[PDB]
Design a protein around this motif. Structure first.
Motif, PDB file in Angstrom:
ATOM      1  N   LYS D  28       0.737  -0.783  -0.325  1.00 32.82           N
ATOM      2  CA  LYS D  28       0.028  -0.500   0.020  1.00 32.82           C
ATOM      3  C   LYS D  28       0.707   1.586   0.146  1.00 32.82           C
ATOM      4  CE  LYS D  28      -4.132  -1.770   1.486  1.00 32.82           C
ATOM      5  NZ  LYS D  28      -5.164  -2.558   2.374  1.00 32.82           N
ATOM      6  N   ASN D  29       2.073   1.084   0.266  1.00 33.68           N
ATOM      7  CA  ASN D  29       3.343   2.200   0.962  1.00 33.68           C
ATOM      8  C   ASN D  29       4.226   2.222  -0.362  1.00 33.68           C
ATOM      9  OD1 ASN D  29       3.746   4.761   1.897  1.00 33.68           O
ATOM     10  ND2 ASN D  29       4.847   3.621   3.248  1.00 33.68           N
ATOM     11  N   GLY D  30       4.682   1.413  -0.998  1.00 32.33           N
ATOM     12  CA  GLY D  30       4.983   1.651  -2.686  1.00 32.33           C
ATOM     13  C   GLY D  30       6.293   0.680  -2.614  1.00 32.33           C
ATOM     14  N   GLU D  31       6.455   0.026  -4.347  1.00 35.28           N
ATOM     15  CA  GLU D  31       6.968  -0.430  -5.009  1.00 35.28           C
ATOM     16  C   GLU D  31       8.624  -0.518  -4.243  1.00 35.28           C
ATOM     17  OE1 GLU D  31       7.598  -0.834  -8.739  1.00 35.28           O
ATOM     18  OE2 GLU D  31       8.415  -2.701  -8.825  1.00 35.28           O
ATOM     19  N   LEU D  32       9.451  -1.612  -3.584  1.00 31.18           N
ATOM     20  CA  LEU D  32      10.778  -1.432  -3.087  1.00 31.18           C
ATOM     21  C   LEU D  32      11.461  -2.990  -2.929  1.00 31.18           C
ATOM     22  CD1 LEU D  32      10.279  -0.107   0.296  1.00 31.18           C
ATOM     23  CD2 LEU D  32      12.483  -1.715  -0.154  1.00 31.18           C
ATOM     24  N   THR D  33      13.061  -2.687  -4.288  1.00 32.18           N
ATOM     25  CA  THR D  33      12.926  -3.925  -4.702  1.00 32.18           C
ATOM     26  C   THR D  33      14.403  -3.732  -4.225  1.00 32.18           C
ATOM     27  OG1 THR D  33      11.655  -3.609  -6.380  1.00 32.18           O
ATOM     28  CG2 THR D  33      12.828  -4.856  -6.867  1.00 32.18           C
ATOM     29  N   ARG D  34      14.987  -4.927  -3.498  1.00 29.24           N
ATOM     30  CA  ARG D  34      16.480  -5.610  -3.732  1.00 29.24           C
ATOM     31  C   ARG D  34      16.815  -6.687  -4.509  1.00 29.24           C
ATOM     32  NH1 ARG D  34      18.729  -2.722   0.732  1.00 29.24           N
ATOM     33  NH2 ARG D  34      20.679  -4.590   0.496  1.00 29.24           N
ATOM     34  N   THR D  35      18.073  -6.429  -4.082  1.00 27.70           N
ATOM     35  CA  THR D  35      19.069  -7.750  -4.995  1.00 27.70           C
ATOM     36  C   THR D  35      19.464  -8.798  -4.196  1.00 27.70           C
ATOM     37  OG1 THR D  35      18.646  -7.326  -7.143  1.00 27.70           O
ATOM     38  CG2 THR D  35      20.411  -8.791  -6.943  1.00 27.70           C
ATOM     39  N   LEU D  36      19.173  -9.894  -3.438  1.00 28.60           N
ATOM     40  CA  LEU D  36      20.250 -10.232  -1.903  1.00 28.60           C
ATOM     41  C   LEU D  36      21.383 -10.562  -2.242  1.00 28.60           C
ATOM     42  CD1 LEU D  36      17.797 -12.081  -0.197  1.00 28.60           C
ATOM     43  CD2 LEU D  36      17.749 -10.031  -0.253  1.00 28.60           C
ATOM     44  N   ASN D  37      21.884 -11.201  -1.512  1.00 27.72           N
ATOM     45  CA  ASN D  37      24.094 -11.216  -1.857  1.00 27.72           C
ATOM     46  C   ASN D  37      22.985 -12.820  -2.306  1.00 27.72           C
ATOM     47  OD1 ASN D  37      26.095 -12.343  -1.992  1.00 27.72           O
ATOM     48  ND2 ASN D  37      26.682 -11.992   0.776  1.00 27.72           N
ATOM     49  N   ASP D  38      24.409 -13.504  -3.111  1.00 24.27           N
ATOM     50  CA  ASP D  38      24.117 -14.881  -3.376  1.00 24.27           C
ATOM     51  C   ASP D  38      24.141 -16.024  -2.344  1.00 24.27           C
ATOM     52  OD1 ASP D  38      24.105 -13.969  -6.817  1.00 24.27           O
ATOM     53  OD2 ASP D  38      26.732 -13.420  -6.831  1.00 24.27           O
ATOM     54  N   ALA D  39      24.756 -15.906  -1.213  1.00 23.50           N
ATOM     55  CA  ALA D  39      24.412 -16.912  -0.363  1.00 23.50           C
ATOM     56  C   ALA D  39      23.011 -16.844   0.494  1.00 23.50           C
ATOM     57  CB  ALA D  39      25.938 -16.665   0.723  1.00 23.50           C
ATOM     58  N   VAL D  40      22.149 -16.311   0.245  1.00 19.94           N
ATOM     59  CA  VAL D  40      20.790 -16.585   0.740  1.00 19.94           C
ATOM     60  C   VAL D  40      20.084 -17.164  -0.451  1.00 19.94           C
ATOM     61  CG1 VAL D  40      19.055 -15.183   1.722  1.00 19.94           C
ATOM     62  CG2 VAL D  40      21.646 -14.641   2.032  1.00 19.94           C
ATOM     63  N   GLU D  41      18.911 -17.901   0.442  1.00 21.06           N
ATOM     64  CA  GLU D  41      18.126 -18.799  -0.465  1.00 21.06           C
ATOM     65  C   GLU D  41      17.177 -18.366  -0.165  1.00 21.06           C
ATOM     66  OE1 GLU D  41      18.215 -23.137  -1.109  1.00 21.06           O
ATOM     67  OE2 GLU D  41      16.727 -23.197  -2.071  1.00 21.06           O
ATOM     68  N   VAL D  42      16.308 -17.542  -0.761  1.00 25.25           N
ATOM     69  CA  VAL D  42      14.678 -17.543  -0.195  1.00 25.25           C
ATOM     70  C   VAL D  42      13.646 -18.019  -0.402  1.00 25.25           C
ATOM     71  CG1 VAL D  42      14.608 -15.377  -1.940  1.00 25.25           C
ATOM     72  CG2 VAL D  42      12.726 -15.276  -0.373  1.00 25.25           C
ATOM     73  N   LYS D  43      12.713 -18.608  -0.126  1.00 32.07           N
ATOM     74  CA  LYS D  43      12.034 -19.399  -0.301  1.00 32.07           C
ATOM     75  C   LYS D  43      10.216 -18.865   0.321  1.00 32.07           C
ATOM     76  CE  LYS D  43      13.537 -23.360   0.822  1.00 32.07           C
ATOM     77  NZ  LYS D  43      14.667 -22.890   1.379  1.00 32.07           N
ATOM     78  N   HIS D  44       9.272 -19.034  -0.175  1.00 30.07           N
ATOM     79  CA  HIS D  44       7.993 -18.219   0.641  1.00 30.07           C
ATOM     80  C   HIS D  44       7.685 -18.712   0.532  1.00 30.07           C
ATOM     81  CE1 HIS D  44       3.668 -15.923  -0.083  1.00 30.07           C
ATOM     82  NE2 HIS D  44       5.000 -14.409   0.127  1.00 30.07           N
ATOM     83  N   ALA D  45       6.927 -19.682  -0.327  1.00 32.94           N
ATOM     84  CA  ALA D  45       5.729 -20.900   0.482  1.00 32.94           C
ATOM     85  C   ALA D  45       4.368 -20.557   1.349  1.00 32.94           C
ATOM     86  CB  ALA D  45       6.724 -21.983   1.632  1.00 32.94           C
ATOM     87  N   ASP D  46       4.149 -19.719   0.449  1.00 34.32           N
ATOM     88  CA  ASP D  46       2.537 -19.728   0.551  1.00 34.32           C
ATOM     89  C   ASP D  46       1.883 -18.735   1.421  1.00 34.32           C
ATOM     90  OD1 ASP D  46       2.422 -21.222  -2.089  1.00 34.32           O
ATOM     91  OD2 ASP D  46       1.874 -22.648  -1.289  1.00 34.32           O
ATOM     92  N   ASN D  47       2.948 -18.501   1.943  1.00 35.32           N
ATOM     93  CA  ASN D  47       2.115 -17.814   4.295  1.00 35.32           C
ATOM     94  C   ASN D  47       3.169 -16.796   4.429  1.00 35.32           C
ATOM     95  OD1 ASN D  47       1.236 -17.411   5.713  1.00 35.32           O
ATOM     96  ND2 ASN D  47       1.586 -19.281   7.039  1.00 35.32           N
ATOM     97  N   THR D  48       4.451 -16.589   4.138  1.00 35.70           N
ATOM     98  CA  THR D  48       5.727 -16.503   4.759  1.00 35.70           C
ATOM     99  C   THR D  48       6.856 -16.241   3.848  1.00 35.70           C
ATOM    100  OG1 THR D  48       5.855 -18.270   6.062  1.00 35.70           O
ATOM    101  CG2 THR D  48       4.111 -16.710   7.401  1.00 35.70           C
TER     102      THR D  48
END
Lengths: 142, 209, 38, 176
Positions: D28-48
RNA sequence: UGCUGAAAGCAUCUAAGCACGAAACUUGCCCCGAGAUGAGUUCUCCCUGACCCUUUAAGGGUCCUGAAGGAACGUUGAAGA
RNA sequence: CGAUGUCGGCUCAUCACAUCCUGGGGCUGAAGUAGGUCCCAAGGGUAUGGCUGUUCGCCAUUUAAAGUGGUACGCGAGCUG
RNA sequence: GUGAAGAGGGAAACAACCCAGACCGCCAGCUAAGGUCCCAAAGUCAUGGUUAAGUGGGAAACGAUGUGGGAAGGCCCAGAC
């Protein structure tokens, strides 16, 4: 009989194009120095330029390890007295990156008239294209 | 912007109304006429080549005459070149007059200075003379020592010694332009510019702020 | 600050931090306890 | 470690796009975008959002923790937003907002005009308060650090641009 | 000097990322500068004949032509040993 | 030792930084002005005289400051003596 | 012990250090010290670790949540830090 000597009138030598994207500087440089001497050919002769013409391209995209991107310093002296002039690796990549690959290879090639003639065969470009389409350089994957 | 090629006419003064004499140099700037325009697509840089004055018909050679003939212009006494400033546009054969400086307020004047020949280091480099008496034996205006001892055992590069002073390109910067006279083709700048009378000048706008 | 070759915690609020390969003593209580180069 | 192990609970109406390493979060407040380090794997899994160390990299745990906190901030930066509050202590210190330029009168011989960047909107309910609001956390931290950096809190009296929450410790003169 | 930020559920200017920061550094200003043998670019100008020989080569020679231009010479110069 | 001229003055430098000035900064027993101390910084700048053969020093009067060293205690096929 | 009176290979260059003692010839092989990415002959060899400082490729007392390993110990899901 006598050991064979290559004759510089009759040396056949080829043209190779090498993409220097993400290669390590010293390891590429050492392979180029080997190919420009002619050490890879069985007709190698230490007083004859038997090597090949290499067209290195994407010279600004060459890589170094550690903090050598900022700590590796290229000194030269201008002849005037307090003329010690240094330039780090990233300053050289910004100003002229051809000088990075050419300094490396030149220091790996034998000093003397022959090794100057060996360095005249290295053609480095900072971009992806070269004028030498007439010589048909085949892609040396190294 | 671009500059124009003049000719050092000499020096005079300009009495102001409140009684302040201003030493001016008079620079006759005739019609500088463009003989070539240079673009990135053919030369790698944007610049105009102008000529000025007039030359004898029998003294201009066939290369040079063919150049001015292509340009569609009378042969002048020389060719000069000015680098262009990214929004400027000139055509070949276009004449440029002193009127260009009707706004500029301060210029830089480039000429060849007066040749003083082989000059010694007291004239050339302002070395200070040694004693004129008190024992001094044949070394009054000589340069003294020229370096150190075993360490280095060489004279360093660009040691100030004697040789040709004068007769080289010098640019005087930030001269106040006093008048622009489009009628008589004149530019009066405040101060001395380099060169003897009749020498060719190059007057550009000042690059300093 | 104090460039010393022995940097130490002088107070209980002093705190050893290595920044840019340099050992430092950052204090919050007293800025005289700020030190460098151990 | 203990930070990377707790998941980022993403609230309703918040858009999360995982393009490889690039993470776009728009609410609701704005588009905000990063690019993480290559040593971080991020997984949504539908909830969190769940953060783990990419295998083969040494310090990846440490990296993962940072990615965690950063995206946590991003979630607040698309839900509630961040707000820094600065106040100006001194005789004749003025703050005003023209558009997004903070005019400041800080006892200088020249006016101070700080250009806020794109995402940040400052207000002045008083002449001696700047309440600036925005979405990215390092950006309002940055801007509040700049406005403080024009006139830092002088130690003897307290004169300067201070944060509203920060304490400024004072001291007396040498003798008398 | 910081901002965000973990390793170290806090703290932390740094490890990932980001912002300032000096007469030093690279440029900006002035001059030299393609022998920069890596000898570059652009514009213009000139030259559009025959015939032999051989150990047939970017070979040698004869005749006819002599251009653009340069050099020499002279009168010289606020150029110059 | 079949010769490497040795103090001081002059002329002419040149490098180091352990910085005298100018420039940036931290702590202060830093209110301001002026300082003290420490980090960074070598761009450019960095006295004239009386006395003395003197370097040095003391004194006089300046200065933003009158740096500390190396260079055969730089420099006599450059001068003095 | 070597040099002196001893060459050759190595230690960049280096009487005296390491290897080794040259009668002559050979466009033959195996080795020592020392080495094998390029100058420059020979592994950019294989397996398992370590350091990120260009450490390697000067320098101590002393300082420090750098980092790999080992043996213990205090508190701890009647919930510790």
């Amino acid at each position: 009989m006598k050991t064979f000597t290559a004759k510089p009138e009759t040396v056949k030598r080829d043209w190779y194009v090498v993409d220097a994207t993400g290669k390590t500087l010293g390891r590429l440089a050492t392979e180029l120095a080997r190919r420009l001497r002619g050490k890879h050919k069985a007709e190698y002769t230490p007083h004859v330029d038997t090597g090949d013409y290499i067209i290195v391209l994407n010279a600004d995209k060459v890589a170094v390890t550690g903090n050598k991107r900022t700590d590796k310093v290229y000194y030269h002296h201008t002849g005037h007295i307090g003329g010690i002039k240094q330039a780090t690796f990233e300053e050289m990549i910004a100003r002229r990156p051809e000088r990075v690959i050419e300094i490396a290879v030149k220091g790996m090639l034998p000093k003397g008239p022959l090794g100057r003639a060996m360095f005249r065969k290295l053609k480095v470009y900072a971009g992806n294209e070269h004028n030498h389409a007439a010589q048909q350089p085949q892609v040396l994957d190294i | 912007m671009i500059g124009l090629v003049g000719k050092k006419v000499g020096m005079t003064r300009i009495f102001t109304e409140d009684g302040v004499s201003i030493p001016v140099t008079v620079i006759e700037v005739e019609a500088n006429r463009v003989t070539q325009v240079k673009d990135l697509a053919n030369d790698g840089y944007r610049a105009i080549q102008v000529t000025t004055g007039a030359k004898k018909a029998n003294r201009v050679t066939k290369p040079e005459a063919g150049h001015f003939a292509k340009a569609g212009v009378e042969a002048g006494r020389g060719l000069w070149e000015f680098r262009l400033a990214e929004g400027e546009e000139f055509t070949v054969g276009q004449s440029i007059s002193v009127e260009l400086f009707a706004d500029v307020k301060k210029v830089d004047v480039t000429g060849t200075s007066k040749g003083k020949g082989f000059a010694g280091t007291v004239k050339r480099w302002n070395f200070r003379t040694q004693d004129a008496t008190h024992g001094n034996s044949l070394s009054h205006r000589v340069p003294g020592s020229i370096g150190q001892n075993q360490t280095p055992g060489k004279v360093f590069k660009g040691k100030k010694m004697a040789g040709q002073m004068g007769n080289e390109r010098v640019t005087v910067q930030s001269l106040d332009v006093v008048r622009v006279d489009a009628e008589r083709n004149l530019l009066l700048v405040k101060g001395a510019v380099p060169g003897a009378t009749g020498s060719d000048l190059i007057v550009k706008p000042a690059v300093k702020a | 600050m104090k460039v010393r070759a022995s940097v130490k915690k002088l107070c209980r609020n002093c705190k050893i931090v290595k920044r840019d390969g340099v050992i430092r003593v950052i204090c919050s209580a007293e800025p005289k306890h700020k030190q460098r180069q151990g | 470690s203990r930070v990377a192990k707790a998941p980022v609970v993403v609230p309703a109406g918040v858009d999360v796009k995982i393009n490889g390493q690039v993470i776009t979060i728009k609410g609701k407040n704005g588009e905000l975008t990063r690019t993480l380090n290559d040593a971080v794997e991020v997984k949504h899994a539908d909830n969190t959002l769940t953060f783990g160390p990419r295998d083969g990299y040494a310090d990846g745990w440490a990296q993962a923790g940072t990615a965690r906190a950063l995206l946590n901030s991003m979630v607040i930066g698309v839900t509630e937003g961040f707000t820094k509050k600065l106040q100006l202590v001194g005789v004749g210190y003025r703050a005003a907002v023209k558009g997004n330029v903070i005019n400041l009168s800080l006892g200088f011989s020249h006016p101070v005009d700080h250009q806020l960047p794109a995402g940040i909107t400052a207000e002045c309910p008083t002449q001696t308060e700047i309440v600036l609001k925005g979405a990215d956390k390092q950006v309002i931290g940055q801007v509040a650090a700049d406005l403080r950096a024009y006139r830092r809190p002088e130690p003897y009296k307290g004169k300067g641009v201070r944060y509203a929450d920060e304490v400024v410790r004072t001291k007396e003169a040498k003798k008398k």
